[PDB]
Design a protein around this ligand. Structure first.
Ligand SMILES: *[C@@H]1O[C@H](CO)[C@@H](O[C@@H]2O[C@H](CO)[C@@H](O[C@H]3O[C@H](CO)[C@@H](O)[C@H](O)[C@@H]3O)[C@H](O)[C@H]2NC(C)=O)[C@H](O)[C@H]1NC(C)=O
Ligand SMILES: *[C@@H]1O[C@H](CO)[C@@H](O)[C@H](O)[C@H]1NC(C)=O
Ligand SMILES: [Ca+2]
Ligand SMILES: [Ca+2]
Ligand SMILES: [Ca+2]
Ligand SMILES: [Ca+2]
Lengths: 493, 492, 501, 501
C-alpha cells in the first residue's frame, strides 16, 4: 500500500480542487457568453467574447515562463481621468477586472496631495473590446464622482455581478492620529450597480471596536469569491487584546533572507519579532488581514475581519487580493524590512457558509525591490523595524503550484521604481524568483512616480496576453500626478 | 504509523471540498448566472442647476464691462489622453445642450504627422455639481470608432437621445482633395444613449460637380428646429453656378479701414482675390452650413448652404452656436484678417427646408491669431492668405442689445499670444477693442493649437463657468494632450 | 490502529455519498432553477410566414440550370403563348410610361422592378420605381402563375434610374444610380453620379444606402447598373455595370491597346486585319460621351444592412469584351454568365461565361469567355445596323438578353454548338417587330413574331425554368411594347413553353 | 484497510468520470434552451405582420363617409386622371379574358377580385378567379398608391362565378356561385347552383365552405352574388344577391302584386296610370328565364370559419325595389346603402338607404328607401334603351354603380338634392363611350369621356375616399375596357381628384 493511496488521494485533491472547479469556471464562461447573444441595457456591461474566457488565470506553463518578453507600449484612449489644474492631485488607484467587466476608482484632492478633511472619489466601470489593430480598448460605460463632504480614503474596489463594491474608510485627521486614538475611523462599503442603483452602508464588523485602533482598506482590488466580497485590510491593533496576545512572539522571515543577511540568526529572529510593533504609530501592532463582506444591500455587522497569522506574513501593509483560477492570492506591500515583492497563496476556510480562517503561503522571491528611506532602502536584507516603502503589486504569469516545491520557479510581471531610496525611475518588468528577465524603463532618469497596479488578461481569439500597468507618474504640466494605464503585450519570444 | 496521520488529514480535505468548497462554488455559479440574465434616458439628464442655464447670453452690456477670469478649477478631465509618448489626440469637438453633452476627438497612433489611418473617440454625458460647487462632467458612455476608416475633421452635435457626428473620409493629402474634381466621402453617424449607432454616407444636393472638396468645420453643430446644423467649408469649382453667383463679392470688416492705409481700390481688389487659391487647385475656398434633418435613414436630405462672400471671409473651419433662439457662427481666420470672427446667422426656410443663410458680423479688432508670413497676427490689410489656427469664442453679452448691432460685445476664449507661432495659450475676456482679463497657461514657449470655449450658468449659485478645451503640446505622454480647463467668469 | 481505520471508512463513505448522491442532487436543483428562468423570457395569428415566399415543389429544383442536351437542342420550338394574370402593373393614364424592367428568379422566389414616368417617356427628370416579389405556383391548366406576395413603390422625389435587381434570401436587393442631368452630361462631368443599394425583405424591412465603391471617385466619370438582373453568389450580390472611365487613370492605362473581336467576324467582314484591329481598338472610346473609355464590369456587394464602401467594382478586360454597355448576370448551376448589350459595332447576341477569382474572401478579378455566335441581330442606326459586320466606333443598339438552353461547356470546343432563346426586334434600324425566337450559333430555328408589322417595342428580358412535375420548360419574355389605350409604353410578361420535337 | 481502494476507486470515478459527464450534459441542456430562445426570436424575423395591412394615416379616417355638405355638393368637379401602377392584372395573350371585378375598401385595407377565362369571354366549365388585398399610401406627387400586399389565384377546376368581395378584419370574404351550365338553364332547373364562401386572411389562412342558407332550396331556382362589394356590418358580412324565385312559394306569394315606380317617373311618362301600374307589376317576371320572379336581395353571413347554414337570405320588397339584378352594398358612416343595377325598364341609377332590423342578434328584415333620381342613364336594347321612361318588362342593361358625395339624409326631404359620382356608358343602346361624371338628381354637373369615340367598355365600380392630410377627396373608377393588343378586356383602376372648386 502506502505508495498507492498517497498518489490516489492526491489525485482526489487535484480532482476536487483544480479539475472540477475549472470545469465549473469554464462552465460559467460559456453560459455567460451564451447570455449576451440574447434605455442602455445592463447586458451592454459584458466584455467582448474574446476576453470572457481569458481573465483571472495563469496564462503560461513553467516552461513558457522562461521565454517571456515585454512588447512595446500600445496607445489607447486612457480611461483614467487626469487633473485640470497644476495642484490637483489624483492618487490611490484601485482596479478590478472579471469575466464580464472592470471597475476603477481613484481619489481626488483639489489642492495638493495631503488633505485629511475633504476629498472626492472618482469611480468608473466598463468593458474591454478589441479595436482594429487587434489590441484592447477599455470602454467606459459609466462614471461617478462621490463628492458630498465624506472624506472617503484608501478605497479598494471589486467587481460584483452587475457592478462594483467599494470599501473606504472616512478620514478626519492625520494617519498618525488614527493610530493613537482608541476608536477606529468610520468604515463604509458602497455598492454601485450598472443599473444606477447605489447603496452605501456604514459597516460594523465584530471584533473591531476596542481591538483595532485604526483600520484601512489595502487600496488594491478586492475580489468576488463564493458570493463574498473579499478586501485587503491593514491597521493597528491595541495592546492587551486577544488578537494581540494570539499574535505574540510570531514572526515571518521569507525563505531567501538567511543567505542574504549576514546578521546572526538569533538577532534576525528578535528583530523580526519586533518588526510588527510601531512606537511611532501609537505602540500598536501593525496588522494585515482580509475583510469579507457578503454581497448584500442591507449591510451592518455581517462583514468579517480576518487577520493573517504573523507567522505567515510580514508587518501590516496595503495590499491586493487576486483570483487565479480557483485560488485566492494576496499581494502585500513591503512597508517593513524586506524590500522584495510579496505574493502569497491564500487558503480560505468557510464554516456555516462563512469565512472563519485564512492561511498564507509565500512565493519565495528575492526579486523586484522597492525604494524605502533610511535603514530600509532597496538594499536592506535584514529584519528590523521599518515603516516605509511603496505599493507595487505583481501579476503571476505562471502557476506557483505547478512545481513540486511551491513557487520554486515562479514568473511574475509588474512595475517598480528602480532606485534605492527615491521614488523615481518607474520600470515595467517580468521577473522570476532571482532575476529580472525582461524590463523597460519609462521616461528619463529621475522621472518621479509612485504606486503601480498590474493586471493581465488573454485575448483568446489571437491567443495573446496583454498586461495593463497602472502607474502614478509625477506630472510637470497638469496635476501633481497623472495616473496612466500603460498597456502592452506579454509575448512568447 | 506516520502515513496514517496525513492520510486522514488529507481525507478531511476531501470531505471539505465535496461538502463545502464545491457546493459553495455551485451556489455562486448559480448566483452570478441568474444575475446576468436578470439584466434581460431619464438618467442622461443634466442637473436641475444647469438645465436652464445653457445656450444663453449671461450678462447685460453694463455687466460685461466688469467681467474677470477666476482661477482654474480642478475637475476630473473627461477627455482621454494617450498612453504612449508618440500617441496623438487632435481635433476636439464639443457640444452642450440643456439635457447633456457630446464630445469627440481624433486619435493617431504613430505621431501627429501621420494623416492616413486614425481612430475617432466619442463620449457623451451630463453635468452635475460637486461639493465645492463647481461642475463635474460626468461621462455616461464612450465609443471608439476603430474600423480602419480614416474619419477626419469631425464635428459633433447633441440631438435628443444622443449625438450626431459629421465626418469626411480622407484618402489622400489635403491639397489633392482640392485638385480632384470628385469630392470625398461624407459621413453622418448617429449615436444614441441606448447604444444604437447608425452611420451613413450622405450626398447633399449640389455637391457633385460643384464642390471639389467638403469638410465639416470641426466646431460643434447645433440642433435647431428639428434640423442639425454643422459648419462646413471646402473648395468650389470654376464655372459652376455657385462660383458665378459668388463672383466679385468680398467682405471687409468694419474695423479694417482705420487700421489699413492702402487705397480703397487696392483693399477691395485684394479682398476679392482672397477667396481664390492657386495652391488649392484654383478653387474658391468657401464657408457654409450643412443642414441635416434628424433621421436614421439619411441619404440626400442633408442640405449644403453657402454663405454669401459679401458677408463672410474666405472659407475656413468654424463652429455653430445657439444663444436663445438665435444661431451664431464662428469662422476661423485662415485669411488676411487675423481677428476673431463671429456672426449672427439668419436662416430662412422655404416649405419646411432651410433655403438660405445670412450672416451679420459682430465687428471686432480683438483677439488675434498667429499666422505665417504677411498674414501673421499683426496684419491688417487684404490679400490672399492660407494660414491661421482654430480659436472660437463665446459671446457673454448680446450683440443685439446695443442700438447698433455689436457696438459693444463681450466674449471669452483662448488664443495663442504670438504673431507667427503656436505658443503661449491664453484664456481671455475681451470686448471689440481690448482684452480686459487674461491668464496665460504654462510658461513662455508652451506649444499649443486649437481651442474650443463653451460657457454655461449654474442657476443655483448664479455663477457662470466656462470650459476652455485647449490642445496642449505634451512632454510626458502623447505629442498632444487635449485639456478641458474650467473656471468661473466672475462679475466684480 | 483501530481508531484511524474505522474513521476513514465512515469518512471515505461520506465522500462516496457526497460525490454520488449529494453533489449530483444540488446539480439537478441548480439546473431546474435556471431552466425556469431562461424559459421565463418568452403572435402567429398575426404572422405571414416567409415560407409563403417559397416557389412550388414543381419549380424549386428546376431553376437556373441548362435544361437540354446538345442533341435535344436541335429539336426545340416555341409553344403558343399562355394566358396568365400579368404581375407587371400597367399605367392608368394615356401618358404614363413604364420602362426598364429588371427581373430575377432563384430557387425560392422572384424579384421584379421597373421605372414609372408620370408624363410621357421623354421626361427623364423625375420618376418613381416599382418593386415586387413573389413566387411561382402551378395553375389547373398546368402552367405557371407568378404570384405577387409584396409590392413597393419608391416614390419620394428621388430620380432612381437604370435599376438592376437580384433575389437574396428573404427578399430583393436593388441597385440604382441617381440621375440629375442628361446621360451625356454624366460622361462629361468628372464626378460620378450617386450610387444606391436598396434591400427589401418580405418582413417589410427596407434599408436603402448610398454606396461608394473604392476606385470609383476620380476614375469613373459615370457608372450605371446594367439593368439586367444581378445574382446571389457565394454570399455576395453581383450586378452588371457600365460607364465611362477617365483618361490617364490606372484603369484607362491598364486597358490601353486592348480590344476584342468575336470569333466569327473574320469570315464575315472583308477588310485586312490591320484596319479591323485598329477600329476595334478605337471602339472603346467615345468622343461624343466626353472622351471617356466606355467600360463594362461587375459590382460585387456583400449582403449586409449597413453598407458604405464594401461594394467592389471589377471591370472586365477589354481583351475579352466589347465596349461597355447594359447587361445582365446569370447563374447556370455554379457558373456565372454575363449578357452584354451590343451597343457597339457587333450587332449579334453577346454571352460569356465569367470566371470570378477571390482573394481573402473578396472578389478580385473577373475573366470572360465568349460563346462565339453570329445570330440574332439587333437594330441600330447608321453604319451600325443589324447588317453591319465590321469593327469601328458605334454608340447605338438596344437591350436584348438571351437564355442558354444547352450548356456551352458540354462540347469539346467551348460554345461550338450553343442554343439560346430570347426576343429581338426583327429589323435593321428600327425598334419594331418584336419576335420571340430560339437559335443556335448560326441560325434561328424557331420564331414567332408578336403583333402586327410595325409594332413598336424596346428591351427584352428572357428567363427560363423547368416544371419538374411535367418536365416542361417555360420561358417568360418580358418585353417593352408601345401602348395605345393606356400608357405610352407598357411592359408585358409573355409566357410560353419550349418543347422538344 | 484493503477496502480503501474499493471506496477510493469510487471516489475517483465519481469526481473524474461521473461528475464531469454530468456537468457536460447539463451544459448542453442549458444551451439547447438558450438556443431555443435564439431560434424563437429568429422566427419573428421571418414574419410580415398583419400590422402591415393598414392604410396610411392620411386615409384611415377618410373612408366610408359622406365627404361634402349639401352646399359643397354644388361646386364639385372632376380633376385630371392621375397615373399610378395599376394593381389590377392584365392578360398576356390576345384571347385572355378578365371580367367581373369586385372591390371593397374599409378603414384598414382593400380587397379586389376578378374572373379570368383563358380563351374568350364565354365559359361555364372553367375559369380562374384572381384575388388581391392591400393598402393605400401617398406618393411624392401627393396622390394615392394602391399597394398590393397579397395576391391569390383560385385555379382548381371549381368554376367560381359572379363573385362579390368584402373586407373582414385581417383579410377578405368572397362569395361566388359555381357555374356548370349557361345562365338560362339555371333559371329552368329547380335546384339552385352551388354557393360558396371563401375567406382569405393576411396570415395565409384560407377557408372555403359550401353554404346552404335556409329558404333557398325549392324556393330559388337560381341565386348569384351581385358582383358589387359586400360590407362588414356589426359582425356580419352582407352581400348583394339576385336570382329567380319559383312560382307558388311563400316568397313568390308574398311578393305578388307588388311593384315599384320611382318618384320621378310620372312627369316623364305619358301612359295611362293604369297601363303603368300593370306593366310595373309584370316587370318582375321573366318568361325567358324559366317563368321566374327575378329578385333582388341580400345575403348575411356571420363571420365564422365553419359556415354551413348560418347564412341568411333576406329579399327586398318588390314595392321598394325594381326587378332583381346585380348590385353593390356600401357603408356611409353607420348607414347601409344599396346600388341596384338597372336591368329593367327604368334606365337610371338606383341607390337606396337600407334599414336592417336585428332579431336577437340576427338580421330579420330589410327595407329600402330610394334616392329619387332621373340622372345617369345606361344603355339597353329595344324598348328599354337609355331614353326609355315607361314601365314594361325589360331584361337588359349593364352594371354601373355610384358613390354618394353628399348625405341624402341631410335635407328635409330625403334625397331632394343628392350628389353622386361614377362612370357610365354614354350611349342609348350600345356599350361604348365610357364616361366618368359627377351628377345630381337631375343633371350631370361634371364629365370626362375616356378614350376615342366608340371605345368599348362594360362594368364600372366607383369608390371615393379622403386624404385627411391634404383634405382632398379621391375617387377610383374601375372600368372594364375593351382591349385590342393584349386581352379581350383590360380592367383599369382610373383615379382622379374630386375637387371643390
Ligand atoms: C434609441 O433611442 C432613439 C431615440 O432617442 C430611438 O429613435 C427614435 O426611433 C423612432 C423609430 O426608429 C423614430 O421614429 C419616427 O416615427 C415614425 C416613423 O418615421 C414617424 O411617424 C415619426 O415622425 C418619426 O419619424 C424617432 O424619430 C427616433 N427618435 C430620435 C430622437 O431620433 C431609437 O429607435 C432607439 N433605439 C432602439 C434600440 O429602440
Ligand atoms: C440593480 O441590480 C441588482 C442586481 O444586479 C439588483 O439586486 C437591484 O435591486 C437592481 N436595482 C434596480 C433598481 O433594478
Ligand atoms: Ca483610532
Ligand atoms: Ca477632390
Ligand atoms: Ca459625371
Ligand atoms: Ca338551376
Amino acid at each position: 500500500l502506502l505508495n498507492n493511496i498517497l498518489s490516489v488521494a492526491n489525485q482526489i485533491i487535484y480532482n476536487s480542487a483544480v479539475a472540477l472547479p475549472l470545469q465549473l469556471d469554464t462552465l460559467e464562461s460559456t453560459l455567460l457568453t451564451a447570455i449576451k447573444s440574447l434605455c442602455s441595457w445592463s447586458a451592454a456591461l459584458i466584455n467582448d467574447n474574446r476576453y470572457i474566457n481569458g481573465i483571472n488565470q495563469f496564462y503560461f506553463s513553467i516552461a513558457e515562463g522562461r521565454n517571456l518578453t515585454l512588447g512595446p507600449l500600445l496607445n489607447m484612449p486612457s480611461f483614467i481621468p487626469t487633473a485640470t489644474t497644476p495642484e490637483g492631485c489624483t492618487r490611490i488607484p484601485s482596479f478590478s477586472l472579471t469575466k464580464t467587466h472592470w471597475c476603477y476608482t481613484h481619489n481626488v484632492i483639489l489642492n495638493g496631495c495631503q488633505d485629511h478633511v475633504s476629498s472626492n472619489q472618482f469611480v468608473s466601470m466598463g468593458i474591454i473590446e478589441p479595436t482594429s489593430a487587434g489590441f484592447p480598448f477599455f470602454r467606459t460605460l459609466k462614471t461617478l464622482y462621490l463628492s458630498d463632504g465624506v472624506n472617503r480614503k484608501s478605497c479598494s474596489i471589486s467587481t460584483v455581478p452587475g457592478g462594483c463594491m467599494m470599501y473606504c474608510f472616512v478620514s478626519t485627521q492625520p494617519e498618525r492620529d488614527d493610530y493613537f486614538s482608541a476608536a477606529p475611523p468610520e468604515q463604509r462599503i458602497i455598492i454601485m450597480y450598472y443599473n444606477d442603483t447605489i447603496v452605501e452602508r456604514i459597516i460594523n464588523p465584530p471584533g473591531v471596536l476596542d481591538v483595532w485602533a485604526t483600520l484601512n482598506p489595502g487600496t488594491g482590488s478586492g475580489v468576488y469569491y463564493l458570493g463574498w466580497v473579499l478586501f485587503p485590510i491593514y491597521g493597528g491593533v491595541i495592546k492587551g487584546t486577544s488578537l494581540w496576545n494570539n499574535q505574540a512572539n510570531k514572526y515571518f522571515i521569507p525563505q531567501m533572507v538567511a543567505a542574504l543577511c549576514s546578521q546572526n540568526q538569533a538577532t534576525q529572529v528578535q528583530n523580526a519579532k519586533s518588526s510588527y510593533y510601531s512606537s511611532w504609530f501609537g505602540n500598536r501592532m501593525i496588522q494585515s488581514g482580509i475583510l469579507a463582506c457578503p454581497l448584500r444591500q442591507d449591510l451592518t455587522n455581517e462583514c468579517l475581519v480576518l487577520p493573517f497569522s504573523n507567522d505567515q506574513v510580514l508587518m501590516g501593509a496595503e495590499g491586493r487580493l487576486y483570483m487565479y483560477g480557483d485560488s485566492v492570492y494576496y499581494y502585500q506591500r513591503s512597508n517593513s524590512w524586506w524590500p522584495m515583492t510579496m505574493l502569497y497563496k491564500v487558503t480560505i476556510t468557510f464554516t456555516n457558509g462563512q469565512p472563519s480562517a485564512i492561511s498564507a503561503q509565500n512565493v519565495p522571491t528575492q526579486q523586484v525591490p522597492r525604494p524605502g528611506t533610511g535603514d530600509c532602502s532597496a538594499t536592506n536584507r535584514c529584519p528590523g523595524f521599518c515603516l516605509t516603502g511603496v505599493y507595487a503589486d505583481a501579476w503571476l504569469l505562471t502557476n506557483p503550484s505547478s512545481t513540486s516545491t511551491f513557487g520554486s520557479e515562479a514568473t511574475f510581471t509588474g512595475s517598480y521604481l528602480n532606485t534605492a531610496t527615491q521614488r523615481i525611475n518607474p520600470t515595467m518588468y517580468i521577473a522570476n524568483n532571482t532575476q529580472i528577465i525582461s524590463s523597460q524603463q519609462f521616461g528619463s532618469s529621475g522621472q518621479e512616480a509612485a504606486y503601480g497596479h498590474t493586471t493581465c488578461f488573454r485575448d483568446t481569439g489571437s491567443v495573446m496576453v496583454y498586461c495593463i500597468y497602472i502607474i502614478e507618474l509625477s506630472s510637470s504640466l497638469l496635476g501633481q500626478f497623472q495616473i496612466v494605464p500603460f498597456i502592452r503585450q506579454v509575448t512568447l519570444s
